[PDB]
Amino acid sequence: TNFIRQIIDEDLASGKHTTVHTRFPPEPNGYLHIGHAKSICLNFGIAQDYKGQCNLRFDDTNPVKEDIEYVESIKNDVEWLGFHWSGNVRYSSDYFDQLHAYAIELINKGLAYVDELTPEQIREYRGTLTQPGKNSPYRDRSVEENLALFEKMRAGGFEEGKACLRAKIDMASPFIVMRDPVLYRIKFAEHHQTGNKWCIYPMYDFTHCISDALEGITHSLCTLEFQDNRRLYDWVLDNITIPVHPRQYEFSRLNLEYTVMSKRKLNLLVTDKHVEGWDDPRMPTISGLRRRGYTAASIREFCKRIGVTKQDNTIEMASLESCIREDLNENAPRAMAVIDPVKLVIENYQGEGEMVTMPNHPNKPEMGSRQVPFSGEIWIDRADFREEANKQYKRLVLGKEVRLRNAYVIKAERVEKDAEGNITTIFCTYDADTLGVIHWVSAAHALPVEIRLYDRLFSVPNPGAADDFLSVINPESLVIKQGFAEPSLKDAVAGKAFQFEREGYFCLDSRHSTAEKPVFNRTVGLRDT
RNA sequence: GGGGUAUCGCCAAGCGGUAAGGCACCGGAUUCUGAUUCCGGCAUUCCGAGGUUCGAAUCCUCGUACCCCAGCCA
Ligand SMILES: Nc1ncnc2c1ncn2[C@@H]1O[C@H](COP(=O)(O)O)[C@@H](O)[C@H]1O
């Protein structure tokens, strides 16, 4: 439970409401991101818990920043997280003729006027946080003139910025938002839904409360910066003929450590090509987290864990990662792949290679097993051989024996070095009856797999508070390796997370993989203690 | 000037009757993955100071810190 649900239980109990109707209203100017997923879980989760409804409304009031590419991706990510909206997809532009009719009501009541103060001047007249504002010389025009001027606006007779419609409230209110907030501005820009029917567009504050009213939203939930704005929400609805009055409630937004959530900044990363695009596995977008190998059930668990409060907060990645780890430890079929490979040849090996049965899940027999090829020339990962090492080290030192995963206890006998003191092969004996572990891949039957080792995109915990967050990108955000994997990984479907034993959970990247050359993204690494 | 918020390293419950829970961290058991599982350890004290009470993180002062607002953006 959280404060919002306690409000909703009060409301039901008092008979204030009989059904709850919430809504998620993303503006289509970018891809959704883990912050948004907190709002999706909240809004759609309350709806299904209370057997209520939840609407998806595209808050498309600003044409010059929005594009149709984002409306289809947003529907796509909302469904992928596992949620569905009530009825049809709604759009603020559905209400464009309705909002205009309401603007005329406000004009006819003398509670709104066409102002002609330039964009610079309205700021000059607005006052400051300590000094009250002052009235526009245009504030007292006749209802009759305001109607005449607003239709001249609607019919594009005024240039952009040369006129706007404003609410007539109080230029000395301590709420800066109530100092005659603009209701309409002129934008000669094609809107991705209404084409060029309109060249006056409504501002967010006017649109938002009338839309919620029209859809019968019982509780508009949004983030803490809209607390002052609630005053204009209630003022608009108290001054127009509307039969209902939704209440707005605010919870704090999500801040994840080591990433930037503003869509203006994410957009710059994509635009200036510092990431592949919105769904790059380093992006904190929902589609990026999907390509990285996250599961919609892991993000719903994240939502569950981070709480819903009024407290400002920054969650450590350790929480996000904890969630995906728990999911994938349960559900990921195990496999073997070597990321940095050095050859290990068993000289004692008699034969052309056998087959060992490997479990698909070490603690869950139910997930079955597979036959993996064993051989004399295997591949091992570099860090698993040390020529000299102290007792803590339980991998292959040149003096002792290690078990190969699900195969033989081998015993280190002789290294062969590359001229630059590097080593090139290790020579070992194997005990024929032996069934400190290391993973391995039969060189003979190995599949070449590209591996993308992903790391946090930024090197500072709060890259947003930096004078230029771009200069604080982590250059090792992605390091591409070429390794080898057991041939069963030939049947990996994109978006099925494997646990590469003693490395991390990895998933195929449909965007780069092909046949013969797969590309595996590392979702997350194992808890290296 | 106005609107908000203070409980563990990060998050969070608590609604006058004696500080939950999760992540991270530190042990120690068990493991053919330095993983997983188990077991245990994690806030005499709740931003500070003062007052009410039998009893205060909860109530009442009076401070202090931080967040948010001056887009014709949302
Ligand atoms: N970081 C965030 N954490 C939680 N909710 C958010 C966050 N960013 C945006 N939202 C919510 O997402 C919805 C649409 O936001 P927007 O994408 O700015 O139009 C609103 O409910 C916002 O309050």
mmCIF file of C-alpha atoms in Angstrom, chain A residues 161-390:
data_model
loop_
_atom_site.group_PDB
_atom_site.id
_atom_site.type_symbol
_atom_site.label_atom_id
_atom_site.label_comp_id
_atom_site.label_asym_id
_atom_site.label_seq_id
_atom_site.Cartn_x
_atom_site.Cartn_y
_atom_site.Cartn_z
ATOM 1 C CA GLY A 161 4.098 34.641 -31.003
ATOM 2 C CA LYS A 162 2.259 37.795 -32.114
ATOM 3 C CA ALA A 163 -0.809 36.946 -29.954
ATOM 4 C CA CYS A 164 -1.936 34.297 -27.423
ATOM 5 C CA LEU A 165 -5.018 33.536 -25.369
ATOM 6 C CA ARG A 166 -4.548 33.904 -21.586
ATOM 7 C CA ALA A 167 -6.570 33.155 -18.470
ATOM 8 C CA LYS A 168 -7.550 36.323 -16.534
ATOM 9 C CA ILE A 169 -6.602 35.282 -12.960
ATOM 10 C CA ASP A 170 -4.241 37.183 -10.594
ATOM 11 C CA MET A 171 -0.893 38.649 -11.748
ATOM 12 C CA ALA A 172 0.221 38.959 -8.084
ATOM 13 C CA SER A 173 -0.590 35.414 -6.970
ATOM 14 C CA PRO A 174 2.282 33.764 -5.166
ATOM 15 C CA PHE A 175 1.625 30.808 -7.527
ATOM 16 C CA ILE A 176 3.584 31.898 -10.645
ATOM 17 C CA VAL A 177 1.357 29.535 -12.710
ATOM 18 C CA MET A 178 -1.820 31.513 -11.799
ATOM 19 C CA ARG A 179 -0.386 34.811 -13.156
ATOM 20 C CA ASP A 180 -2.550 34.696 -16.253
ATOM 21 C CA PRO A 181 -1.437 31.408 -17.717
ATOM 22 C CA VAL A 182 -1.379 31.106 -21.502
ATOM 23 C CA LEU A 183 -4.126 28.811 -22.737
ATOM 24 C CA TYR A 184 -3.490 28.886 -26.500
ATOM 25 C CA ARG A 185 -0.520 29.788 -28.656
ATOM 26 C CA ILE A 186 -0.034 29.868 -32.425
ATOM 27 C CA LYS A 187 2.003 27.159 -34.120
ATOM 28 C CA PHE A 188 1.762 26.873 -37.910
ATOM 29 C CA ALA A 189 2.953 23.218 -37.725
ATOM 30 C CA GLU A 190 1.420 20.040 -39.073
ATOM 31 C CA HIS A 191 0.186 17.893 -36.265
ATOM 32 C CA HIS A 192 0.669 14.111 -36.617
ATOM 33 C CA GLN A 193 -3.119 13.474 -36.160
ATOM 34 C CA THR A 194 -5.014 16.632 -37.022
ATOM 35 C CA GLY A 195 -2.841 17.472 -40.073
ATOM 36 C CA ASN A 196 -3.127 21.204 -40.619
ATOM 37 C CA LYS A 197 -6.683 21.663 -39.361
ATOM 38 C CA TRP A 198 -5.415 23.662 -36.419
ATOM 39 C CA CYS A 199 -2.805 26.309 -36.094
ATOM 40 C CA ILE A 200 -3.656 27.316 -32.537
ATOM 41 C CA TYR A 201 -2.762 24.601 -29.954
ATOM 42 C CA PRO A 202 -3.759 24.287 -26.277
ATOM 43 C CA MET A 203 -1.283 24.393 -23.475
ATOM 44 C CA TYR A 204 -0.815 21.456 -21.168
ATOM 45 C CA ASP A 205 -2.640 22.885 -18.123
ATOM 46 C CA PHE A 206 -5.837 23.743 -19.931
ATOM 47 C CA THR A 207 -5.849 20.404 -21.859
ATOM 48 C CA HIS A 208 -5.057 18.170 -19.014
ATOM 49 C CA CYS A 209 -7.930 18.868 -16.649
ATOM 50 C CA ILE A 210 -10.637 19.135 -19.255
ATOM 51 C CA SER A 211 -9.474 15.772 -20.813
ATOM 52 C CA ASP A 212 -9.517 14.037 -17.454
ATOM 53 C CA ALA A 213 -12.956 15.457 -16.778
ATOM 54 C CA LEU A 214 -14.279 14.328 -20.147
ATOM 55 C CA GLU A 215 -12.987 10.786 -19.657
ATOM 56 C CA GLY A 216 -14.294 10.638 -16.084
ATOM 57 C CA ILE A 217 -10.843 10.087 -14.532
ATOM 58 C CA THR A 218 -11.365 9.738 -10.822
ATOM 59 C CA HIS A 219 -7.765 10.471 -9.736
ATOM 60 C CA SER A 220 -5.062 12.079 -11.906
ATOM 61 C CA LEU A 221 -1.756 10.872 -10.559
ATOM 62 C CA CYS A 222 1.440 12.631 -11.672
ATOM 63 C CA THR A 223 4.838 13.754 -10.402
ATOM 64 C CA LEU A 224 5.693 16.292 -7.723
ATOM 65 C CA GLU A 225 6.512 19.296 -9.998
ATOM 66 C CA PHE A 226 2.796 19.518 -10.846
ATOM 67 C CA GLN A 227 1.813 20.331 -7.222
ATOM 68 C CA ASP A 228 1.703 24.085 -7.864
ATOM 69 C CA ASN A 229 -0.036 23.347 -11.205
ATOM 70 C CA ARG A 230 -2.903 21.669 -9.340
ATOM 71 C CA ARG A 231 -4.193 25.207 -8.619
ATOM 72 C CA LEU A 232 -4.713 25.881 -12.317
ATOM 73 C CA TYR A 233 -6.230 22.359 -12.742
ATOM 74 C CA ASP A 234 -8.890 23.209 -10.198
ATOM 75 C CA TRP A 235 -9.363 26.811 -11.439
ATOM 76 C CA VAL A 236 -10.130 25.775 -15.062
ATOM 77 C CA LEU A 237 -12.577 23.119 -13.955
ATOM 78 C CA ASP A 238 -14.275 25.443 -11.460
ATOM 79 C CA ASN A 239 -14.963 27.990 -14.247
ATOM 80 C CA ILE A 240 -16.387 26.008 -17.214
ATOM 81 C CA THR A 241 -19.544 23.894 -17.487
ATOM 82 C CA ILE A 242 -18.219 20.418 -16.744
ATOM 83 C CA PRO A 243 -20.133 17.876 -14.626
ATOM 84 C CA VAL A 244 -17.218 16.260 -12.771
ATOM 85 C CA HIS A 245 -14.065 17.385 -11.027
ATOM 86 C CA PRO A 246 -11.164 14.875 -10.963
ATOM 87 C CA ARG A 247 -8.653 15.271 -8.141
ATOM 88 C CA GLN A 248 -4.902 15.369 -8.879
ATOM 89 C CA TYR A 249 -2.393 13.614 -6.568
ATOM 90 C CA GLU A 250 1.372 13.709 -6.884
ATOM 91 C CA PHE A 251 4.084 11.174 -6.026
ATOM 92 C CA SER A 252 7.870 11.658 -6.471
ATOM 93 C CA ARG A 253 9.615 10.815 -9.694
ATOM 94 C CA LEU A 254 12.186 8.089 -10.271
ATOM 95 C CA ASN A 255 15.836 9.022 -10.422
ATOM 96 C CA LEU A 256 18.122 6.168 -11.307
ATOM 97 C CA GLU A 257 21.766 6.410 -10.373
ATOM 98 C CA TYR A 258 24.274 6.800 -13.304
ATOM 99 C CA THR A 259 21.721 7.691 -15.902
ATOM 100 C CA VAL A 260 19.811 10.679 -17.213
ATOM 101 C CA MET A 261 16.039 10.497 -17.478
ATOM 102 C CA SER A 262 15.184 13.771 -19.190
ATOM 103 C CA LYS A 263 13.929 13.076 -22.725
ATOM 104 C CA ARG A 264 15.759 16.256 -23.904
ATOM 105 C CA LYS A 265 19.072 14.721 -22.875
ATOM 106 C CA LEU A 266 18.284 11.166 -24.078
ATOM 107 C CA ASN A 267 17.322 12.783 -27.365
ATOM 108 C CA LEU A 268 20.750 14.467 -27.575
ATOM 109 C CA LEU A 269 22.544 11.130 -27.072
ATOM 110 C CA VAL A 270 20.552 9.687 -30.002
ATOM 111 C CA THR A 271 20.768 12.771 -32.231
ATOM 112 C CA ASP A 272 24.513 13.230 -31.776
ATOM 113 C CA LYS A 273 25.019 9.480 -32.376
ATOM 114 C CA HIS A 274 26.614 8.614 -29.016
ATOM 115 C CA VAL A 275 24.318 5.568 -28.710
ATOM 116 C CA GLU A 276 22.789 3.490 -31.513
ATOM 117 C CA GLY A 277 19.405 4.981 -30.841
ATOM 118 C CA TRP A 278 16.547 4.878 -28.404
ATOM 119 C CA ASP A 279 16.665 1.144 -27.909
ATOM 120 C CA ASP A 280 20.405 0.851 -27.431
ATOM 121 C CA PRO A 281 21.124 -1.563 -24.542
ATOM 122 C CA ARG A 282 22.726 1.259 -22.477
ATOM 123 C CA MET A 283 19.744 3.612 -22.766
ATOM 124 C CA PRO A 284 17.375 3.603 -19.726
ATOM 125 C CA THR A 285 14.414 3.399 -22.133
ATOM 126 C CA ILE A 286 12.000 0.462 -21.874
ATOM 127 C CA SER A 287 12.954 -0.754 -25.379
ATOM 128 C CA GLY A 288 16.686 -0.505 -24.545
ATOM 129 C CA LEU A 289 16.146 -2.503 -21.340
ATOM 130 C CA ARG A 290 14.262 -5.009 -23.513
ATOM 131 C CA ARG A 291 17.141 -5.316 -26.060
ATOM 132 C CA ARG A 292 19.548 -5.666 -23.143
ATOM 133 C CA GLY A 293 17.633 -8.738 -21.999
ATOM 134 C CA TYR A 294 15.426 -7.474 -19.202
ATOM 135 C CA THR A 295 12.088 -9.091 -18.661
ATOM 136 C CA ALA A 296 8.764 -7.219 -18.251
ATOM 137 C CA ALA A 297 8.314 -9.184 -15.046
ATOM 138 C CA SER A 298 11.627 -7.865 -13.686
ATOM 139 C CA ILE A 299 10.594 -4.220 -14.213
ATOM 140 C CA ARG A 300 7.200 -4.839 -12.600
ATOM 141 C CA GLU A 301 9.143 -6.203 -9.630
ATOM 142 C CA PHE A 302 11.308 -3.056 -9.631
ATOM 143 C CA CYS A 303 8.145 -0.906 -9.441
ATOM 144 C CA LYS A 304 6.954 -3.014 -6.526
ATOM 145 C CA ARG A 305 10.222 -2.551 -4.638
ATOM 146 C CA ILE A 306 10.957 1.178 -5.085
ATOM 147 C CA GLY A 307 7.698 2.186 -3.341
ATOM 148 C CA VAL A 308 5.457 5.196 -4.136
ATOM 149 C CA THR A 309 6.043 8.180 -1.806
ATOM 150 C CA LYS A 310 6.398 11.989 -1.670
ATOM 151 C CA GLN A 311 10.088 11.602 -0.848
ATOM 152 C CA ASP A 312 12.641 12.699 -3.431
ATOM 153 C CA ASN A 313 14.908 9.745 -4.127
ATOM 154 C CA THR A 314 17.622 8.200 -6.279
ATOM 155 C CA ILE A 315 17.656 4.474 -6.636
ATOM 156 C CA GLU A 316 20.930 2.672 -7.004
ATOM 157 C CA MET A 317 21.330 0.403 -10.034
ATOM 158 C CA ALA A 318 21.943 -2.359 -7.462
ATOM 159 C CA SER A 319 18.135 -2.468 -7.078
ATOM 160 C CA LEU A 320 17.392 -2.671 -10.831
ATOM 161 C CA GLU A 321 20.018 -5.338 -11.404
ATOM 162 C CA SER A 322 18.912 -7.266 -8.315
ATOM 163 C CA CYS A 323 15.499 -7.678 -9.964
ATOM 164 C CA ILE A 324 16.679 -8.990 -13.291
ATOM 165 C CA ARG A 325 19.142 -11.298 -11.592
ATOM 166 C CA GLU A 326 16.466 -12.890 -9.461
ATOM 167 C CA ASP A 327 14.214 -13.462 -12.489
ATOM 168 C CA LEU A 328 16.913 -14.859 -14.682
ATOM 169 C CA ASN A 329 18.480 -17.089 -12.010
ATOM 170 C CA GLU A 330 15.129 -18.807 -11.759
ATOM 171 C CA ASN A 331 14.380 -18.944 -15.404
ATOM 172 C CA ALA A 332 17.523 -18.855 -17.489
ATOM 173 C CA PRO A 333 18.732 -22.082 -19.091
ATOM 174 C CA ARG A 334 22.478 -22.412 -18.434
ATOM 175 C CA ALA A 335 25.086 -22.713 -21.229
ATOM 176 C CA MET A 336 28.851 -22.193 -21.899
ATOM 177 C CA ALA A 337 30.757 -19.563 -23.838
ATOM 178 C CA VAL A 338 34.298 -18.237 -23.432
ATOM 179 C CA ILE A 339 34.717 -14.519 -23.911
ATOM 180 C CA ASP A 340 38.520 -14.134 -23.866
ATOM 181 C CA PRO A 341 39.812 -17.481 -25.233
ATOM 182 C CA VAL A 342 43.161 -19.280 -24.780
ATOM 183 C CA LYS A 343 43.653 -22.873 -25.965
ATOM 184 C CA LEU A 344 44.024 -25.740 -23.508
ATOM 185 C CA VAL A 345 45.077 -29.060 -25.042
ATOM 186 C CA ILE A 346 44.689 -32.320 -23.237
ATOM 187 C CA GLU A 347 47.533 -34.534 -24.497
ATOM 188 C CA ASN A 348 46.263 -37.701 -22.708
ATOM 189 C CA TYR A 349 43.076 -37.559 -24.828
ATOM 190 C CA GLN A 350 42.314 -40.761 -26.669
ATOM 191 C CA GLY A 351 39.620 -40.404 -29.278
ATOM 192 C CA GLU A 352 37.907 -37.870 -31.523
ATOM 193 C CA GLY A 353 35.707 -36.427 -28.827
ATOM 194 C CA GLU A 354 32.907 -37.616 -26.643
ATOM 195 C CA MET A 355 29.606 -36.134 -25.463
ATOM 196 C CA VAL A 356 28.826 -35.091 -21.929
ATOM 197 C CA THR A 357 25.277 -34.614 -20.654
ATOM 198 C CA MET A 358 24.947 -31.159 -19.224
ATOM 199 C CA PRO A 359 21.962 -30.036 -17.157
ATOM 200 C CA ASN A 360 20.045 -27.082 -18.631
ATOM 201 C CA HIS A 361 19.597 -25.845 -15.003
ATOM 202 C CA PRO A 362 21.881 -27.011 -12.076
ATOM 203 C CA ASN A 363 19.234 -26.653 -9.321
ATOM 204 C CA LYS A 364 16.128 -27.525 -11.354
ATOM 205 C CA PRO A 365 16.088 -31.011 -12.956
ATOM 206 C CA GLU A 366 12.780 -30.183 -14.616
ATOM 207 C CA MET A 367 14.447 -27.999 -17.275
ATOM 208 C CA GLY A 368 16.050 -31.047 -18.923
ATOM 209 C CA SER A 369 19.544 -31.601 -20.251
ATOM 210 C CA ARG A 370 21.512 -31.472 -23.441
ATOM 211 C CA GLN A 371 24.379 -33.363 -24.949
ATOM 212 C CA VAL A 372 27.432 -31.095 -25.267
ATOM 213 C CA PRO A 373 30.643 -32.200 -27.052
ATOM 214 C CA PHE A 374 33.777 -32.821 -24.985
ATOM 215 C CA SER A 375 37.199 -33.038 -26.656
ATOM 216 C CA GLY A 376 40.999 -32.788 -26.189
ATOM 217 C CA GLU A 377 41.461 -29.264 -27.588
ATOM 218 C CA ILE A 378 39.110 -27.158 -25.545
ATOM 219 C CA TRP A 379 38.953 -23.356 -25.187
ATOM 220 C CA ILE A 380 39.217 -21.788 -21.790
ATOM 221 C CA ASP A 381 38.885 -18.226 -20.668
ATOM 222 C CA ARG A 382 42.152 -16.475 -19.870
ATOM 223 C CA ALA A 383 41.504 -15.429 -16.251
ATOM 224 C CA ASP A 384 41.014 -19.020 -15.230
ATOM 225 C CA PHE A 385 44.675 -19.866 -15.542
ATOM 226 C CA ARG A 386 47.279 -18.427 -13.227
ATOM 227 C CA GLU A 387 50.933 -19.570 -13.245
ATOM 228 C CA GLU A 388 51.288 -18.629 -9.570
ATOM 229 C CA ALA A 389 48.414 -17.957 -7.139
ATOM 230 C CA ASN A 390 47.513 -17.948 -3.423
#
